Write a protein that binds this ligand. Structure first.
Ligand SMILES: NC(=O)c1ccc[n+]([C@@H]2O[C@H](COP(=O)([O-])OP(=O)(O)OC[C@H]3O[C@@H](n4cnc5c(N)ncnc54)[C@H](O)[C@@H]3O)[C@@H](O)[C@H]2O)c1
Ligand SMILES: NC(=O)c1ccc[n+]([C@@H]2O[C@H](COP(=O)([O-])OP(=O)(O)OC[C@H]3O[C@@H](n4cnc5c(N)ncnc54)[C@H](O)[C@@H]3O)[C@@H](O)[C@H]2O)c1
Ligand SMILES: NC(=O)c1ccc[n+]([C@@H]2O[C@H](COP(=O)([O-])OP(=O)(O)OC[C@H]3O[C@@H](n4cnc5c(N)ncnc54)[C@H](O)[C@@H]3O)[C@@H](O)[C@H]2O)c1
Ligand SMILES: NC(=O)c1ccc[n+]([C@@H]2O[C@H](COP(=O)([O-])OP(=O)(O)OC[C@H]3O[C@@H](n4cnc5c(N)ncnc54)[C@H](O)[C@@H]3O)[C@@H](O)[C@H]2O)c1
Ligand SMILES: [Ca+2]
Ligand SMILES: [Ca+2]
Ligand SMILES: [Ca+2]
Ligand SMILES: [Ca+2]
Lengths: 269, 270, 269, 275
């Protein structure tokens, strides 16, 4: 079992990719700590995860036979993350693997992007990643082991219309990934990013995103973003890149960005 | 060259912001400059003073141009917005904007203090967003703008102890390219300059010299290593000329780009 | 922006961008050496320059007051270039500025790309650039001064369908640029690339490429490659970026790639 | 599980190509491997021999798999096509291709001999082109392929005295993105691995150690470690071929169907400094 006797922390673990990552790590043998904000944002048009979503991930992780701990945590809140990390380090015996998956997407054109919306997207997606790295690194340093995977986007090395907040945060995540990779280099820690294309999760599959109306009605616009026919990839397709990077054998892969985007990267760098 | 045009420069009190302002003034633009004019508790070197800002105003005026200034924190969107309105009432609509206000810090993860992260992200990235958001309505209305953001050599690389600064300068590029999309159909371009080591009070000060080793000569080797060519520091005017190239009316079809002025550091990378 | 006392070499100087660069450098005070193969190629579907084309550019340069030398030279022939450089040392005082502009475009899908076509595109566009830098470098080292501008493309940092040969050569040119920037760094020489988008020249404005098929018929297809709604830019828009780079005051800009691509670069790195 | 899959590996006589060949075999693939098996006039270290290639053949068949081999120069498209048809016939068609054949040289501009430029561009860039061209028709017919090209840390950076090598490796990445375009509709993916300093006979030889540490008449491994290690972020001057092999296996997996046109660095943090 590849990951037996490891422990993983996944932020935004209540649904979508975060649940996917937690469940696959659990199946391969890791104990799991998941957290999620479990509430809506006024500046986000689609519903975020709920308390029941989170319990369901816990139930799915436990079904594999692993230990799981969970908590309602806003990654913007550094003290809150640090407290939950302390619990996990003590309940599960140190955190080996951190996935900074918590994140939000918005659509709004410049100059009419609301400061509160900018704040939340930068805050959750970029500062929340910073807060998560900074929260797990001391334990990984003391243990001279870790694998941190950050989550950027296709949009983390490109750009589109009406995406200033989201794109700025996902570019900064890549910069952040490479710095953490420097600072933690000497302690047996790696830091890499996954950059997904369009993934079928409740971030993209909801009535607000459809509005800006069927799945069938929106597919062509999503498909234009990809080189390959596929309008949406499965969360599992990103999870297997995550698992490749957080393997112990990825000791000398650090500071990298791995795209899972159906050939969108074929168009660019 | 720039006669009849009006340019907004943030962090206009000294350093590269002063150089940009004066060069645009000599070329014929009227200038609107703003600066924080105060220190920050999480930045180890002194920031500009009001006297620095008043100096840039006199330099711009010594060219024959008109100049207005204001004490402004670019983290404050509403402050920027009122200063834009202030500027246009006096000098006409803003045609050119340089998002130059910025700060640098040195701190290793995971001992990066949250207030310092907030400050750096806030000034460098959120401040750039606030400046663009401040100027764009009038550029859209007038159907003309040239916006230059300021990233860094570190905006497309990374180094030790620079998480806040590097994350911000990466952010600036993605923002630049985004602003280049939303603004595209209104005759507005948005490009970044990415300077290497530049001789300004950001780099030339005791705090930076102390932390990198204390005199100029003792820190030259450290700064030289970052460049491919031998020159430890470049003149701010070397960045300014890149700015002027990009904000030229003739640059209507250059948008979403990153122009490095980094003494060959970009020869080692993308 | 004054080049009095300087001599500039422009390959593919017979028409299009080379001619644009040659005339503008001459206007700004530079003496000029221009060469072109002046001959069609069997693996390129549109016509290349004629000897009359080259004589026009000589005449256009001389009208500015400058001295000009010209020769029929295929840039794949290193010895021919070196011979033309030697004529430039003897007559014009040696080449201070070089623009490796000579190049060709082809269209063909893998796996049906003919080796003879791959060879000609890599030879002219990639090796031809190498041959030009190698030919002009020794004189620039001897005088401790040089400005070299190579010509890549929006496709030298992206990719598209049916363009393996072209795209590969233009990617290689960017690597070569950054290599030449290294080797020549100690000698007062800079090496930078321009990367144009769709430019109105005889490379794009011809029967073959348009393939009854008029300009107004192809405009929307060319426009889709740009972000701004301009299907083609003028050669002069590329030329002014070249002048910016080869200026004496650009001594500390080296190894860079300057896009002139109407916002294509806004979507990518 | 690559059981029932056939992999072509060029440069399979030693180094990373042998590493790829043995791992794919162990994982269930049958193997077609080819190599030049002859030194080059313009490369300063020895290349592989026919006995090297035979060694790889023997090691693969020890795993229980079928293996075919040929002396092939990747610069010769017709020779690659002949070898591919022989593979198609004996082993049922090539599902996976790793374009590993390549060489490195050292020479400062403008003193780069044309003949060295031509060989490096020819083997590294054109030979990758040739390999892609040769295997793609079978992959198209069967509507399945996984192609991995081999660029380098230097395919997205530059250094002194490597114009030939660096131009070739940049070219490879562009070519990779175009093949990904051209072949996308036929169930074929094309990705690059970009290795850092790898312990193979390309780097571990008397010619290479002589360069970097010449002021030093008889340079040993230990005398060169520090200069190689300054190219990496992490301590290790050299990585194992198997560390690249493992990325190769990730990419050529059937499950990697929606990863195409990407460049995967295995470079011990070098990519942490850059893009
Ligand atoms: N869905 C896509 O197509 C796609 C594409 C590229 C990148 N991504 C990225 O992948 C990541 C996961 O997204 P997903 O597709 O699973 O969407 P999702 O909305 O289903 O999952 C995101 C989870 O993060 C949680 N969250 C949001 N803000 C939080 C906060 N402040 N603190 C803690 N938790 C918070 C949400 O409650 C939710 O459960 C995000 O970073 C996103 O930007 C997604
Ligand atoms: N100097 C370098 O080597 C170098 C290298 C790369 C990028 N940069 C960037 O160039 C830009 C200019 O910096 P500089 O080198 O001229 O240094 P500087 O410190 O002399 O100038 C920066 C100016 O911005 C002002 N400022 C800081 N925070 C502000 C805020 N919140 N609101 C308004 N004004 C504020 C400062 O008071 C100062 O006058 C910055 O974005 C910096 O990151 C500098
Ligand atoms: N036109 C575009 O949209 C475009 C876009 C990006 C890059 N480019 C590049 O710009 C450069 C200039 O092209 P252009 O648009 O002026 O096209 P062009 O065909 O008008 O000019 C190229 C010139 O180079 C000459 N040439 C071709 N092969 C040669 C060889 N072996 N030796 C010497 N000369 C040779 C041709 O005769 C021609 O006169 C080329 O490198 C091209 O790849 C063009
Ligand atoms: N070793 C490193 O540090 C490193 C780093 C990055 C990339 N690479 C690349 O990895 C690939 C494999 O190199 P390696 O380190 O395994 O070195 P290697 O020299 O041990 O193996 C390369 C093999 O390719 C063969 N070869 C050379 N030219 C050929 C040709 N024209 N036709 C057929 N075969 C030919 C050689 O005979 C040799 O057996 C190369 O593309 C190299 O550029 C190596
Ligand atoms: Ca076990
Ligand atoms: Ca006038
Ligand atoms: Ca105006
Ligand atoms: Ca042997």
């Amino acid at each position: 079992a590849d990951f037996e006797g490891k422990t993983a922390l996944i932020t935004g673990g209540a649904r979508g990719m975060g649940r996917s990552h937690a469940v696959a790590l659990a199946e391969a043998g890791a104990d799991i700590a998941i957290c999620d904000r479990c509430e809506n944002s006024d500046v986000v048009g689609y519903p975020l995860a709920t308390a029941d979503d989170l319990a369901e991930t816990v139930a799915l992780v436990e079904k594999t036979g692993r230990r799981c701990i969970s908590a309602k945590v806003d990654v913007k809140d550094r003290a809150a993350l640090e407290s939950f990390v302390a619990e996990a380090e003590d309940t599960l015996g140190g955190i080996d693997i951190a996935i900074t998956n918590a994140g939000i997407s918005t659509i709004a054109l410049l100059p009419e992007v609301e400061s509160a919306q900018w704040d939340e997207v930068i805050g959750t997606n970029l500062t929340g990643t910073f807060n998560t790295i900074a929260a797990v690194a001391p334990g990984m340093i003391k243990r001279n082991y870790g694998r941190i995977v950050t989550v950027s986007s296709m949009l983390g090395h490109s750009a589109n219309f009406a995406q200033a907040s989201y794109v700025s945060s996902k570019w900064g995540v890549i910069g952040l990934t490479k710095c953490a990779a420097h600072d933690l280099v000497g302690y047996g820690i790696t830091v890499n990013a996954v950059a997904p294309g369009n993934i079928e999760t409740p971030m993209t599959h909801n009535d607000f995103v459809f509005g800006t109306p069927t799945l069938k009605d929106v597919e062509s616009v999503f498909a234009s973003l990809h080189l390959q026919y596929a309008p949406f990839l499965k969360p599992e397709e990103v999870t297997r890149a995550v698992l490749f990077l957080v393997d112990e054998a990825s000791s000398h892969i650090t500071g990298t960005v791995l795209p899972i985007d159906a050939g969108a990267t074929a168009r660019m760098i």
